[PDB]
């Protein structure tokens, strides 16, 4: 269930410190199991992460080995990194698994977590009007008779409309028995009522606000975002 | 260029205002153009968004109206609502377009900038596994031998690594030139090389530690990780 590959973590996890410590110029590990017990090359990696300077102390001995994991677990405690049950006698005393665990937590949080970190960056590069169009797309791509490319003329005909709602909920009605109404103020009036009776949706719009040559894109966006806040919304983002 | 209807503002919002004023069973308003004049009904629609008590000034007065408004604006400035240009004069005075504006800044605030609300809450409920899944998988939704469901055994063919890089740098290579190279432990070295020399991308992987029984899910992760870090990061949210 794991396949947790202790000896592929040992390598690639090596792999990774040595990457950092390399864009840090700053010397390679050989061994995991070994070379971080003084504490040293845990500071060492800290420093390039951080940008502080991590003083480390002499020692030969154990005692300095262990003010040097402490100070490192304090930085990385510091930076809300995952340290569940890793102590500094765990680090010194050689606990392999531990080791792993340790590292794991560096890079989940600082290279791992950019994922999510890029994400709501991309969020930030984009407003809700894009991610609302993005949504009605993306709800009306099996739907070949809409096409929806902005918040005002794509909605006239009606058909948009009863297609997002549609896409969502496939039990309120028949999408062809849509289509074949050729009133463009009845396919509207349709999906007004499916969504204030069925939905639970206020008509902030009349047919004649959307069934018309220039029809306002606040009111039909205000009306859509009523239809987001209510119904799934998978959207694309980045 | 815009399709501002403002004659369709003036219902719709009138809608919206009221249906927030049946919400917390408050009086509806009729005109928009001089029911919020005095400032008692802006006040009013800020308690049920707000939660304060705005007390409101007697008035039968200008002066009262304004302070009215004044306090509607720096509740609203609280609330980081946009108010350039909106003055209480201009609400005061009846000037249509700016009571229009203040109205749809509002809207905006607590229904349109809802969208990106929701979306920012559903990340939240998500991890950067997952978000790398949906990425790897919207990235090679066009190369049907591969199928990625794991950060394990979907990666052993060396298959769904090359479709990944593939599918953002067709220029760097031919998909049927490795999907006609039997084998797997070659696909792999392909893509890690294309990866460190075309990508920058630094070679943590061995083909040992994929194509392999038990592949080790962390390295891998990591591994996609990095190449998600330089390609271009289109994800599936909420």
Same mark, same amino acid.
């Given at each position: 269930?794991?396949?947790?590959?202790?000896?592929?973590?040992?390598?690639?996890?090596?792999?990774?410190?040595?990457?950092?410590?390399?864009?840090?110029?700053?010397?390679?590990?050989?061994?995991?199991?070994?070379?971080?017990?003084?504490?040293?090359?845990?500071?060492?990696?800290?420093?390039?992460?951080?940008?502080?300077?991590?003083?480390?102390?002499?020692?030969?001995?154990?005692?300095?080995?262990?003010?040097?994991? =402490?100070?490192?677990?304090?930085?990385?405690?510091?930076? =809300?990194?995952?340290?569940?049950?890793?102590?500094?006698?765990?680090?010194?005393?050689?606990?392999?698994?531990?080791?792993?665990?340790?590292?794991?937590?560096?890079?989940?949080?600082?290279?791992?977590?950019?994922?999510?970190?890029?994400?709501?960056?991309?969020?930030?590069?984009?407003?809700? !009007?894009?991610?609302?169009?993005?949504?009605?797309?993306?709800?009306?791509? =099996?739907?070949?008779?809409?096409?929806?490319?902005?918040?005002?003329?794509?909605?006239?005909?009606?058909?948009?409309?009863?297609?997002?709602?549609?896409?969502?909920?496939?039990?309120?009605?028949?999408? =062809?028995?849509?289509?074949?109404?050729?009133?463009?103020?009845?396919?509207? !009036?349709?999906?007004?009522?499916?969504?204030?009776?069925?939905?639970?949706?206020?008509?902030?719009?009349?047919?004649?606000?959307?069934?018309?040559?220039?029809?306002?894109?606040?009111?039909?966006?205000?009306?859509?975002?009523?239809?987001?806040?209510?119904?799934?919304?998978?959207?694309?983002?980045?």
């Amino acid at each position: 269930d794991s396949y947790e590959r202790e000896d592929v973590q040992k390598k690639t996890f090596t792999k990774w410190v040595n990457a950092q410590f390399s864009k840090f110029g700053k010397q390679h590990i050989e061994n995991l199991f070994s070379d971080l017990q003084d504490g040293r090359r845990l500071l060492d990696l800290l420093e390039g992460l951080t940008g502080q300077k991590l003083p480390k102390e002499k020692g030969s001995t154990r005692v300095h080995a262990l003010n040097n994991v =402490n100070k490192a677990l304090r930085v990385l405690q510091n930076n =809300n990194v995952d340290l569940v049950n890793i102590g500094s006698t765990d680090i010194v005393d050689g606990n392999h698994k531990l080791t792993l665990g340790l590292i794991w937590n560096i890079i989940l949080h600082w290279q791992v977590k950019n994922v999510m970190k890029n994400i709501m960056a991309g969020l930030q590069q984009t407003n809700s !009007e894009k991610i609302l169009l993005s949504w009605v797309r993306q709800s009306t791509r =099996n739907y070949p008779q809409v096409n929806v490319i902005n918040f005002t003329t794509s909605w006239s005909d009606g058909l948009a409309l009863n297609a997002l709602i549609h896409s969502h909920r496939p039990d309120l009605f028949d999408w =062809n028995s849509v289509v074949s109404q050729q009133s463009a103020t009845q396919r509207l !009036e349709h999906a007004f009522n499916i969504a204030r009776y069925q939905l639970g949706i206020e008509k902030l719009l009349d047919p004649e606000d959307v069934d018309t040559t220039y029809p306002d894109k606040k009111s039909i966006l205000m009306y859509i975002t009523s239809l987001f806040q209510v119904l799934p919304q998978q959207v694309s983002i980045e």
